[PDB]
Amino acid sequence: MKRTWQPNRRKRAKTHGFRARMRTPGGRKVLKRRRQKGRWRLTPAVRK
Amino acid sequence: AVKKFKPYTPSRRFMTVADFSEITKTEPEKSLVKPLKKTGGRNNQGRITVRFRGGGHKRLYRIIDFKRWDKVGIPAKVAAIEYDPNRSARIALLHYVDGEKRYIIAPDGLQVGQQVVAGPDAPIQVGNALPLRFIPVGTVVHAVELEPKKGAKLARAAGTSAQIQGREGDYVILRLPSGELRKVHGECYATVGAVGNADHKNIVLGKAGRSRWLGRRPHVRGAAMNPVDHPHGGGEGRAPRGRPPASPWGWQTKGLKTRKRRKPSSRFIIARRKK
RNA sequence: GAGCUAGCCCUGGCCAGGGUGAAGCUGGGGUGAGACCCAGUGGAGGCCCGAACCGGUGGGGGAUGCAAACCCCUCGGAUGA
RNA sequence: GAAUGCCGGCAUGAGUAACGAUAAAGAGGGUGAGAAUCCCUCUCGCCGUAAGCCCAAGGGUUCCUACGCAAUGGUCGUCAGCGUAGGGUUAGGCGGGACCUAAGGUGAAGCCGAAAGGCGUAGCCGAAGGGCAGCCGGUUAAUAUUCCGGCCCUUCCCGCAGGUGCGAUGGGGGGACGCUCUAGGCUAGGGGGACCGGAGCCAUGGACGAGCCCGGCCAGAAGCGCAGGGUGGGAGGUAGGCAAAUCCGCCUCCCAACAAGCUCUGCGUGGUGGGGAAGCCCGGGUGACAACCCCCCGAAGCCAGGGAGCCAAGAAAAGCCUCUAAGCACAACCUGCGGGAACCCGUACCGCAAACCGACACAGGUGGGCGGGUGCAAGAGCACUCAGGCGCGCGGGAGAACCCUCGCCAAGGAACUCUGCAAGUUGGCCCCGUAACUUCGGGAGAAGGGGUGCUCCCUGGGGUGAUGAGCCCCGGGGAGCCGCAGUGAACAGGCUCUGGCGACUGUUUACCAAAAACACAGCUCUCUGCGAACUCGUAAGAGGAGGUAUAGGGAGCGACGCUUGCCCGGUGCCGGAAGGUCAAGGGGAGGGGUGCAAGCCCCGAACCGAAGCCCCGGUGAACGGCGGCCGUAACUAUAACGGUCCUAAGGUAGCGAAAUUCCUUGUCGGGUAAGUUCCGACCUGCACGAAAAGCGUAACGACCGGAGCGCUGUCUCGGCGAGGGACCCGGUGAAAUUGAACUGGCCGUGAAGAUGCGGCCUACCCGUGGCAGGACGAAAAGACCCCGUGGAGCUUUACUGCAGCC
RNA sequence: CGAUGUCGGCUCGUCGCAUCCUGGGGCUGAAGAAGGUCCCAAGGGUUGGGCUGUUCGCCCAUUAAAGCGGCACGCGAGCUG
RNA sequence: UGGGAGAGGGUGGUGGAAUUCCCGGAGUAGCGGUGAAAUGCGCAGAUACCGGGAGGAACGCCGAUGGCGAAGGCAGCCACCUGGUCCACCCGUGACGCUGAGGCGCGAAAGCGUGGGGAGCAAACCGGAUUAGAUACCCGGGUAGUCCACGCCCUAAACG
RNA sequence: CCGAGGGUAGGGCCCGUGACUGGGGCGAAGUCGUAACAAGGUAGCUGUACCGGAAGGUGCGGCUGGAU
Numbered sequence A: 001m002k003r004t005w006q007p008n009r010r011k012r013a014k015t016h017g018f019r020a021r022m023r024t025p026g027g028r029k030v031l032k033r034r035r036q037k038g039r040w041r042l043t044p045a046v047r048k
Numbered sequence B: 001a002v003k004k005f006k007p008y009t010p011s012r013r014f015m016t017v018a019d020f021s022e023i024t025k026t027e028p029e030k031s032l033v034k035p036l037k038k039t040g041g042r043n044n045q046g047r048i049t050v051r052f053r054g055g056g057h058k059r060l061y062r063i064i065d066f067k068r069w070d071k072v073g074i075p076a077k078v079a080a081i082e083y084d085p086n087r088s089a090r091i092a093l094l095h096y097v098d099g100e101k102r103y104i105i106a107p108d109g110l111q112v113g114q115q116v117v118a119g120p121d122a123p124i125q126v127g128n129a130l131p132l133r134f135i136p137v138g139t140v141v142h143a144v145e146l147e148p149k150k151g152a153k154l155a156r157a158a159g160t161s162a163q164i165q166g167r168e169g170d171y172v173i174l175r176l177p178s179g180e181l182r183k184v185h186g187e188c189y190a191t192v193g194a195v196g197n198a199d200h201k202n203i204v205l206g207k208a209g210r211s212r213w214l215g216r217r218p219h220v221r222g223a224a225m226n227p228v229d230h231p232h233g234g235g236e237g238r239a240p241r242g243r244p245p246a247s248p249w250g251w252q253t254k255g256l257k258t259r260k261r262r263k264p265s266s267r268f269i270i271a272r273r274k275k
Numbered sequence C: 001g002a003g004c005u006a007g008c009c010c011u012g013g014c015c016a017g018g019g020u021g022a023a024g025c026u027g028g029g030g031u032g033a034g035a036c037c038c039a040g041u042g043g044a045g046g047c048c049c050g051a052a053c054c055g056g057u058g059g060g061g062g063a064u065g066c067a068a069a070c071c072c073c074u075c076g077g078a079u080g081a
Numbered sequence D: 001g002a003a004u005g006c007c008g009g010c011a012u013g014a015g016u017a018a019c020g021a022u023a024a025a026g027a028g029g030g031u032g033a034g035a036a037u038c039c040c041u042c043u044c045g046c047c048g049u050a051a052g053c054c055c056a057a058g059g060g061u062u063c064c065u066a067c068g069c070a071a072u073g074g075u076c077g078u079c080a081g082c083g084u085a086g087g088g089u090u091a092g093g094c095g096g097g098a099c100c101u102a103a104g105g106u107g108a109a110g111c112c113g114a115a116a117g118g119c120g121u122a123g124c125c126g127a128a129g130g131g132c133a134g135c136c137g138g139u140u141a142a143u144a145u146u147c148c149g150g151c152c153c154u155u156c157c158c159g160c161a162g163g164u165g166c167g168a169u170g171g172g173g174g175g176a177c178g179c180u181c182u183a184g185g186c187u188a189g190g191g192g193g194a195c196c197g198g199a200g201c202c203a204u205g206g207a208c209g210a211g212c213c214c215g216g217c218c219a220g221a222a223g224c225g226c227a228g229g230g231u232g233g234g235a236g237g238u239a240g241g242c243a244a245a246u247c248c249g250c251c252u253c254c255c256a257a258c259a260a261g262c263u264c265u266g267c268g269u270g271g272u273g274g275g276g277a278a279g280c281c282c283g284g285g286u287g288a289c290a291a292c293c294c295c296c297c298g299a300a301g302c303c304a305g306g307g308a309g310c311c312a313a314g315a316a317a318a319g320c321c322u323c324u325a326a327g328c329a330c331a332a333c334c335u336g337c338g339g340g341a342a343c344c345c346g347u348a349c350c351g352c353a354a355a356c357c358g359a360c361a362c363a364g365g366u367g368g369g370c371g372g373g374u375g376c377a378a379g380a381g382c383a384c385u386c387a388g389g390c391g392c393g394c395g396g397g398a399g400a401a402c403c404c405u406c407g408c409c410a411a412g413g414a415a416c417u418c419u420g421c422a423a424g425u426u427g428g429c430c431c432c433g434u435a436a437c438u439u440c441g442g443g444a445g446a447a448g449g450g451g452u453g454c455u456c457c458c459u460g461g462g463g464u465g466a467u468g469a470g471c472c473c474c475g476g477g478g479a480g481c482c483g484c485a486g487u488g489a490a491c492a493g494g495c496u497c498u499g500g501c502g503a504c505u506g507u508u509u510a511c512c513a514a515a516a517a518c519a520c521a522g523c524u525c526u527c528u529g530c531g532a533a534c535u536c537g538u539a540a541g542a543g544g545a546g547g548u549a550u551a552g553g554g555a556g557c558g559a560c561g562c563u564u565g566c567c568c569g570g571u572g573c574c575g576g577a578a579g580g581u582c583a584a585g586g587g588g589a590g591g592g593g594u595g596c597a598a599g600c601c602c603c604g605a606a607c608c609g610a611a612g613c614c615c616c617g618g619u620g621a622a623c624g625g626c627g628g629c630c631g632u633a634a635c636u637a638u639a640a641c642g643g644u645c646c647u648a649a650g651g652u653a654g655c656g657a658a659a660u661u662c663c664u665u666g667u668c669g670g671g672u673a674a675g676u677u678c679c680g681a682c683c684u685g686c687a688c689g690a691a692a693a694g695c696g697u698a699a700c701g702a703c704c705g706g707a708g709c710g711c712u713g714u715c716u717c718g719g720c721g722a723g724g725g726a727c728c729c730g731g732u733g734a735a736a737u738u739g740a741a742c743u744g745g746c747c748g749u750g751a752a753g754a755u756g757c758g759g760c761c762u763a764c765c766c767g768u769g770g771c772a773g774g775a776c777g778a779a780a781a782g783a784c785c786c787c788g789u790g791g792a793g794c795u796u797u798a799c800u801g802c803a804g805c806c
Numbered sequence E: 001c002g003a004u005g006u007c008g009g010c011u012c013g014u015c016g017c018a019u020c021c022u023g024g025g026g027c028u029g030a031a032g033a034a035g036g037u038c039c040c041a042a043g044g045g046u047u048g049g050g051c052u053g054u055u056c057g058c059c060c061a062u063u064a065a066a067g068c069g070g071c072a073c074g075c076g077a078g079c080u081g
Numbered sequence F: 001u002g003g004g005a006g007a008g009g010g011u012g013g014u015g016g017a018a019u020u021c022c023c024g025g026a027g028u029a030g031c032g033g034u035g036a037a038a039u040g041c042g043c044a045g046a047u048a049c050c051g052g053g054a055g056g057a058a059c060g061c062c063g064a065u066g067g068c069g070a071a072g073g074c075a076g077c078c079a080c081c082u083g084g085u086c087c088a089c090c091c092g093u094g095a096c097g098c099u100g101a102g103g104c105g106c107g108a109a110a111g112c113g114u115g116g117g118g119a120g121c122a123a124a125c126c127g128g129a130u131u132a133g134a135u136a137c138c139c140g141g142g143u144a145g146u147c148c149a150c151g152c153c154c155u156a157a158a159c160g
Numbered sequence G: 001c002c003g004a005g006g007g008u009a010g011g012g013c014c015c016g017u018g019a020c021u022g023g024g025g026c027g028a029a030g031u032c033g034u035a036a037c038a039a040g041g042u043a044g045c046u047g048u049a050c051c052g053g054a055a056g057g058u059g060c061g062g063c064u065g066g067a068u
Ligand SMILES: CC(C)C[C@@H]1CCO[C@@H]2[C@H](CN[C@@H]2C(=O)N[C@H]2[C@H]3O[C@H](OCC/C=C\[C@H]2C)[C@H](O)[C@@H](O)[C@H]3O)C1
Pocket: D782, E003, E005, E006
């Protein structure tokens, strides 16, 4: 049956992307934590 | 004269439709329409604030002229009478001698080809507009402004009117469509005659899909819900109200008056509605 | 977190074929005029039958599955809420 | 040494289940160390509204070529979507951007919020919507509307010529729209040809034929032809389109009007450029100077912004055209022609799937376009087949039980069972024919019957063409032939009677409930005069609604019919300028502390003093509620009648052992041989009853009862047969579980149900196929039940607060 | 209570005897035939149906008879539900 | 042809008396009601009185033993549309007449549907009296309805 | 071919019967009230409506077949 992951490049980038994160106090704390943790990727990569 | 149908489906048994005889023109005036932005009942938050809305036929808004003191003295001809889907009343296409074109809601008895005019001096004829003070006591009247130059507010839907009762200083006394007696200021404009399409009230929707076309989504009874939802929700089996009948937000809904106590307009309400 | 699901908004798309035969209209009859009746035309409808599509009624199978809800037979809607 | 401990390792179950759709294989030849599995050929089977082909998403090198086979692949592997390496994606016209706007988002101005932030007209962003210029063929191992070939086109810049008041983000027009139905004419696509081109073929009894088999086109600028779309021309007035205006709108006059003209599309033609089969020969080559023609069918596509009807009344903005304003009229714009200029990103490949979403090369899920032929009434249905694609990445045997899916069955026919659950029956089309009841539509495919193939002959009408022939579509009558059977295969209702519930079509517990539940038109109450009520928000601001009482909110009821009774003492709500109570505050009689005193400081009675409550009324489609005992008639029985206690008032009509009836399978009637169910009645209704509606009700229902007919493997009562497994052999090889085990029966014993203790009995050692009585077998720290001064949801006249409202 | 699955049916039995039938007996208010009552006896047998979920029970048609109980109210790693 | 009387009928308009309710003022201890009373209303200011307003329904006197209509039935006043009818003249047609099963239309009140309207009145209903009871008569309330539009119903002591 | 009739299926009229139910007639001395006849003690009757153990009562309109 229809499962829950239905990938969509626009959806991905607009929801979790760098610019969404920066627009908001909470998304900025996300970027800041993943930086402090040393994540290689602060945001999901999509082809765009 | 609402039209019937033969019972050739279960729903056509009772369905009635407006007859549309007074309609003389079946597409609107392109310069007078704009897109009517459907809300779904949602506000700028995205939240439903009026339940059970959405899903209606697409519609264009028709700009209606509710001032009409805009063009004092300039007569206009009644070019057409048209269906407006944003309102119960029909609407009248007016060609000013100006060349300007405008819609008004269509009063009962109005005829294509006739002239209407607006102003302190206008004739007392169905379709004309004058400040309230210049209209004779006893005149039936519609599209009444409520405060001067603020726009027609009262008696706009199909079939309705206000009657002018008497004067008192700067104010005339109107008997509104609801039966209330109200002092309305005399410089408020009003249009002579009653709103038309009086047969509107006798249309029988006939089937559930019809309310759907109007953008009315099904209404769920509180008695049908659970306690998390509603005062009336819950109970094993069916259940009576079991408490003063209430709205979803808990306020009583049989009798409880809700007009604000200390409202400045109270001084201008002579007598509340009856019946 | 509404890329699942629920509602709504905007903008597009889709519904083989067959059946029934409303109003109206034309004519005929009718009458003082009428209602009305008859025939033809007409093509309405949360109309009928049935694919696609949407479903999930009953049974059977599956049950460390092909599958963390599937498969077979059967069955509901299918111009509409 | 234990913690259903943690991490890792390794056992057991076991050479066991399984190896992922039952569309299916066989052989020969090659390659190689090795071949059921790779390559090639021939035979066989499967899909073919796909299991073929083209887009979009998503994926991201998986594409092509060489070399490989450790691991991945459910087996094998020489093969591969695997490993190594090299190569491969080419655009002014395709798609997106340098264009537009939609919801929405963002947001100069502006508004609001302790902070963070929330809003917000314009504007900006935002597309699968609008707008916009490329078709056909060839080429590569791999890209092609991209390269190449042919023939077309767009914009930008600059120049020449002709023309004109040029000129905009401003005005205006247009763009610009629904649903159903649908006309003419075309095209796509298809069928046929006794015509045209072709390698060939004559078999096995016959055919050298008007034979078989193959093919008979595609693109195309101007011009022309056919068919459509769009559009009145002139003049005078002008106060409106937030400046202007010669434009637009409005008034008037004249001329034109089913036209025409102009304009724009589609289709045909068209210089020209391509393509071009079967067969045969080794992707190629020939065929081939290939032929390229006639007739018919014919779209849902095109002409298109076409037409008609209808109500639920159907985007925006740009491009474009017109108007004019600053300006400028040496300019500038318009048309023609010429030269020059024309960027960024994508393009490989998979794409109903082994490459996407499902941990897997997973029987599941995934939007758009094309989707051939024949027959079956039609069709995208069904069967078979084209092009094209496949045989589903374990096989080989065997022919037990048992299981699955399937076929048939004597006599009987529901006796089966909770129940005809299941499976039969029925089944398309044409014709005849069809009941109660009904809201006059319906019920209806009611029911029930008859017909159905092939052949010859006669004949009616339509389409195309020409009025004919031919081709095509609908028939009509007569006579015949064959079979068990003519929708001869496949796809395709069992019917009736009668209750309960719900009017109806709809909706629902994704994944145990589809229903009698929810919704529904309709009815009633009630709130709301608009800066409405109400809702979301601290607010601003939004929704309500660019609506205005024929409207909007809330509530119950639930089509329709006939109806909806009595109670206002309690609670609610509504009304009530009196009265009572009542907080802060007012007042300050009268006290008090302190100071020598002026004073400073504190307590403080009467009295004035909101809402709320009390109090007086109203109100039921507001919350709700609608009696008890005793007596009584000329047979008995029963009580129309009476007496009395109590109530706020004592249940009306209608219905009733009911989706409600405890006693209960009440009682009587029906149906049956027999009826706890069913239907009809009765009424001592444990415990119906009138919008938590009462009683009915045509139609409707995958709802729940009851009956009958039809027919059956449901059954008496089983039998046989098919295939997929089970079984054997080769390959690969799990699992939960598991204190250890050298693990029998009885009768007792034991913490009360013993392989394990006692006494007896029985018993050589080890497997394989089977069955499930036991190991209080597995699974899951019982969901029942209680306990914990454990949790959470929900309610209220529990307590205590808060928002909100007064 | 870190689970001893629960009513009825179906299927498959096996056991007790306080015996329903069949065999053998004594007493009878046993003439006969047929009953009654008690004794011995468990070898075998102990039907089909209508109602209900039912066990049970009632009823129909039969029978030599239409027995009563135990086995975790026998039997759900056997089915149903 | 010329004239007449008339509540004949339909549509629109519109006038005064009265009742009720509302507002203002003035005023106070009762009003109402009956056979008698009670219920009811009233110091929260009623009744009785004055002015203003709102609204529905009916039209006093004229009015009659009257008039008109086929009947049912029709009554303020006005205009319009319209039927019937009588008289005069003796002008026109030349028996063109009477009745009439069926058919069609009209048809008090009550009642029914859908809208509206609602002052007075009032089935039902509530209460107060009466009474043995009193589901009545009398008193206080009171909903349909009585009114208007359209559509039904089609009855009658529709009687002379 | 037609054909007595037999069979299947479905309608139409009639007759008989049916738990129970509706009112009707009749019946020497039952129970309840007293509606009508007199102004019958509320004139009666009346079509209709609604209500009530019962006769009846009331509303609306009509008749005199009403008294004084
Ligand atoms: C009056 C009655 C309530 C007496 C009651 C009967 C219920 O159960 C019995 C209780 C006594 N214990 C029984 C029980 O727990 N049984 C459970 C079974 O659960 C699974 O079987 C299917 C579930 C059925 C039963 C559940 C509850 C599981 O597989 C079985 O092993 C077993 O755990 C008594």
